[PDB]
Amino acid sequence: RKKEFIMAELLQTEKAYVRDLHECLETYLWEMTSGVEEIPPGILNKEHIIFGNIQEIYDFHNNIFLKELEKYEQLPEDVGHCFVTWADKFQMYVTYCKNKPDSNQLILEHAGTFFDEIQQRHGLANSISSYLIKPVQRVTKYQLLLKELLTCCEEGKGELKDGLEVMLSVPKKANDAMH
Amino acid sequence: MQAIKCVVVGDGAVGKTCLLISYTTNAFPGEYIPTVFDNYSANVMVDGKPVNLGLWDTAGQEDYDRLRPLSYPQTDVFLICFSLVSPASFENVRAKWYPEVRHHCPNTPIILVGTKLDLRDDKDTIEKLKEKKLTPITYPQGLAMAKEIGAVKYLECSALTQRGLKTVFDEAIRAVL
Numbered sequence: 001r002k003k004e005f006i007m008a009e010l011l012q013t014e015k016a017y018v019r020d021l022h023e024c025l026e027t028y029l030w031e032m033t034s035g036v037e038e039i040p041p042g043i044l045n046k047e048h049i050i051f052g053n054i055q056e057i058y059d060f061h062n063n064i065f066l067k068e069l070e071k072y073e074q075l076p077e078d079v080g081h082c083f084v085t086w087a088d089k090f091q092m093y094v095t096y097c098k099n100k101p102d103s104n105q106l107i108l109e110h111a112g113t114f115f116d117e118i119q120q121r122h123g124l125a126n127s128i129s130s131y132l133i134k135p136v137q138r139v140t141k142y143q144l145l146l147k148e149l150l151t152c153c154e155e156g157k158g159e160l161k162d163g164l165e166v167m168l169s170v171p172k173k174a175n176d177a178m179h
Numbered sequence: 180m181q182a183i184k185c186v187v188v189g190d191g192a193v194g195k196t197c198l199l200i201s202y203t204t205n206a207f208p209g210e211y212i213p214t215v216f217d218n219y220s221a222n223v224m225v226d227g228k229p230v231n232l233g234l235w236d237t238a239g240q241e242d243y244d245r246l247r248p249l250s251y252p253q254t255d256v257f258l259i260c261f262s263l264v265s266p267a268s269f270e271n272v273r274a275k276w277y278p279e280v281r282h283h284c285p286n287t288p289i290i291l292v293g294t295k296l297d298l299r300d301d302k303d304t305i306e307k308l309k310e311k312k313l314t315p316i317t318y319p320q321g322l323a324m325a326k327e328i329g330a331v332k333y334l335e336c337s338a339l340t341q342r343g344l345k346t347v348f349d350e351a352i353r354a355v356l
């Protein structure tokens with residue numbers, strides 16, 4: 001039961017993460033790249049700084065990682081393997097976190113209410129800043145879910161320990177890369 | 180209408196996630212405690228003025244000293260938390276949480292919240308602590324800590340019983356108005 005509630009959260013919060021990144025790309029990013037609205041010169045053509053590599057992280061989760069977690073739904077005690085299999089892909093969270101302070105500064109100093117205006121228009125509960133912390137949140141959150149699985153999975157639990165090792169290591173490497 | 184960013188910080192032992200879930204859903208989560216509380220916003224009226232209240236969890240980030248501050252900028256108020264039945268979390272208010280919050284947000288109001296009020300009178304919890312030559316944290320300990328860090332209020336709450344829980348967040352709001 002506990003292992004089942006945890007896997008179900010892993011899956012449900014994964015779906016919502018993908019949804020949230022998707023929203024972010026096809027609103028806050030799409031306004032800027034479209035050319036349908038007045039873009040402050042201070043942020044113009046700096047969408048790579050604002051959003052960092054969030055497209056690539058979205059593509060990972062949307063094309064692969066959510067499809068593969070789904071396949072571990074009835075195999076919670078093995079889901080650590082999923083993170084080992086895709087370990088190199090999570091290296092892009094290092095890149096994302098390195099860039100987040102530069103993204104925050106940029107939005108503060110040079111974007112005015114550009115994005116506030118878009119939020120209001122589209123009727124979004126989440127600010128662009130809310131969306132843009134999500135990758136940071138998500139990448140620290142996986143190791144919580146794995147620890148929870150360790151508290152309720154038996155001697156078939158190297159198929160978690162190694163998953164966890166990886167998902168402890170990605171955020172530490174992101175943490176260790178900041179100025 | 181006024182938008183309020185509220186970030187909840189503190190040790191894993193406070194039950195940040197549980198606190199926010201139990202606040203927003205008006206009920207202790209019960210059987211299973213979820214590890215994930217996604218950034219929240221909802222309308223509440225406080226002293227007759229309606230407000231949009233933003234809530235950001237920080238659980239999972241406790242070992243990443245340079246990742247946590249990514250959430251800090253533009254915050255309107257902090258809940259710095261400790262569990263009333265972990266002296267270590269309480270000491271960490273001083274040692275870890277208040278320092279990094281003042282460094283990054285020097286003029287942002289803090290509420291000091293003691294969680295797990297329901298466990299302060301629990302024999303088994305009391306006993307487990309007495310075996311480590313410790314006791315729970317009492318009211319004047321909170322007051323003294325609040326003062327030391329410059330908190331606008333010290334409040335005690337339980338996610339389990341809902342005692343003090345609505346008030347925590349009301350006062351978070353009042354400290355911004």
Ligand SMILES: Cc1cc(NC(=O)NCCCN2CCN(c3ccccc3)CC2)no1
Pocket residue numbers: 193194195197198209210294295296297298336337338339
């Ligand atoms: C934050 C925060 C937490 C808090 N108060 C608490 O944590 N109080 C202690 C609750 C722990 N108890 C153990 C497990 N229970 C259970 C067992 C078997 C089946 C179903 C349920 C129910 C709950 N106050 O603030």
